[PDB]
Design a protein around this ligand. Structure first.
Ligand code: HQL
Ligand code: HQL
Ligand code: GSH
Ligand code: GSH
Ligand code: MG
Lengths: 198, 198
């Protein structure tokens, strides 16, 4: 079908969807809006948030709901219902953390303090839990790559911008990142995608 | 299989799982732990959070990941691939808001202030979007109840404790709550479950 992804000109929450389209070799319109155009767009969306994915004109929302929709019946989903649950759980654990950052905090005072606290205190704890969860395994779930591995690489890439030494004590997590980045379709997207901070 | 759900003695994040077990008429061990017994259990979990659901000796985590797992191949999941996406999206939209509340706040005074601001300044926009989304339909997604309807009833039940007039401008959302509460299996669970504040 005809796919149209709408988001800001950032990797952000739309990147997981972009990785899936690239991996599955699916053509889509990568619509990146300008902040000045958001207000009008927002008023037309059922829940006023992006990303959204239009499939033949029908609008879908929530980045992870869309990602799950696109990976169902593909080799990125998980090989059993239980493994699919593990994929979803890891994705939500990562998303829970990313969602904790108060980008909308009214007071720039508290906002700055919270970011530093999450990066210096919480981040290291999560990295340790993920490292232990992965153990000596090749991928986070099963014996093959899943979109949970994609989300790990995506989330860690942005966190590394704020805290470069995040994975100094976890080489196995770095290796996993490199494995995802080395996947042909993914590597090709990473090299051609717009270069943005977030 | 044999199911063992572990959570605190409260509805909270485990309630969606409990509703699903009730609706599907599935037996399970509803393990409710006292605060004092949490520390020693927490240290044994990969990510140190509850609820967790043990299925034939294997542990699953993340409430919504578990809920999705339990509804797969059942009438609660959504009738089409697209509708299953909408179910996931509505659930995440609700969970996104619930996750905004600062339960970790130290000052009880400040904590209540933040809760009241979220319920007064932010909740109204979400309630309006949900009402508009529902329109004059019987259920949020499709023509039959889904676990998204369950989650709406569960989330709104607790929010109403803090903001009694939350739905005074949205009778259609109240009607939906009543419909969920009237389903025999669900009604039975609501009447027999332990009475807790949250
Ligand atoms: C997966 C999930 C979430 C993220 C986060 O980045 C998103 C949401 C925040 N967004 C903020 C830019 C705000 C802004 N205002 N003016 N200029 N820039 C960018 C995209 C996220 C969460 C935690 C730490 C960093 C980034 C990324 C991936
Ligand atoms: C679905 C999603 C999230 C919730 C929230 O309730 C949880 C979060 C924190 N938990 C803290 C209680 C600690 C405590 N111990 N003894 N007394 N108090 C209770 C359950 C939630 C989020 C937003 C508003 C209200 C409730 C419920 C359902
Ligand atoms: N959990 C949702 C988050 C949706 C969200 O908050 N999107 C932000 C951009 S990253 C947005 O639309 N904010 C603009 C606004 O709230 O006005 C997802 O993963 O899609
Ligand atoms: N998004 C996760 C949240 C998990 C979570 O934060 N659980 C809380 C209880 S509601 C917990 O384990 N907190 C106790 C602690 O962190 O020690 C879910 O839905 O399962
Ligand atoms: Mg979430």
């Amino acid at each position: 079908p005809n796919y149209k992804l709408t988001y800001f000109n950032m990797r952000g929450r739309a990147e997981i969807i972009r990785y899936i389209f690239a991996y599955l070799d699916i053509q889509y319109e990568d619509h990146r809006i300008e902040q000045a155009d958001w207000p009008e767009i927002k008023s037309t969306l059922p829940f006023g948030k992006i990303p959204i994915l239009e499939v033949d004109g029908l609008t879908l929302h929530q980045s992870l709901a869309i990602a799950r929709y696109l990976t169902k019946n593909t080799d990125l989903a998980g090989n059993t219902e239980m493994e699919q649950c593990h994929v979803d759980a890891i994705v939500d654990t990562l998303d829970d953390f990313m969602s904790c950052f108060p980008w909308a905090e009214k007071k720039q005072d508290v906002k700055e303090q919270m970011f530093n606290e999450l990066l210096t205190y919480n981040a290291p704890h999560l990295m340790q839990d993920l490292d232990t969860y992965l153990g000596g395994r090749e991928w986070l779930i099963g014996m093959s790559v899943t979109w949970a591995d994609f989300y790990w690489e995506i989330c860690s890439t942005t966190l590394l911008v704020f805290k470069p030494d995040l994975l100094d004590n976890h080489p196995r997590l770095v290796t996993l990142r490199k494995k995802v980045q080395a996947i042909p379709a993914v590597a090709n997207w990473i090299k051609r995608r717009p270069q943005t901070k977030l």
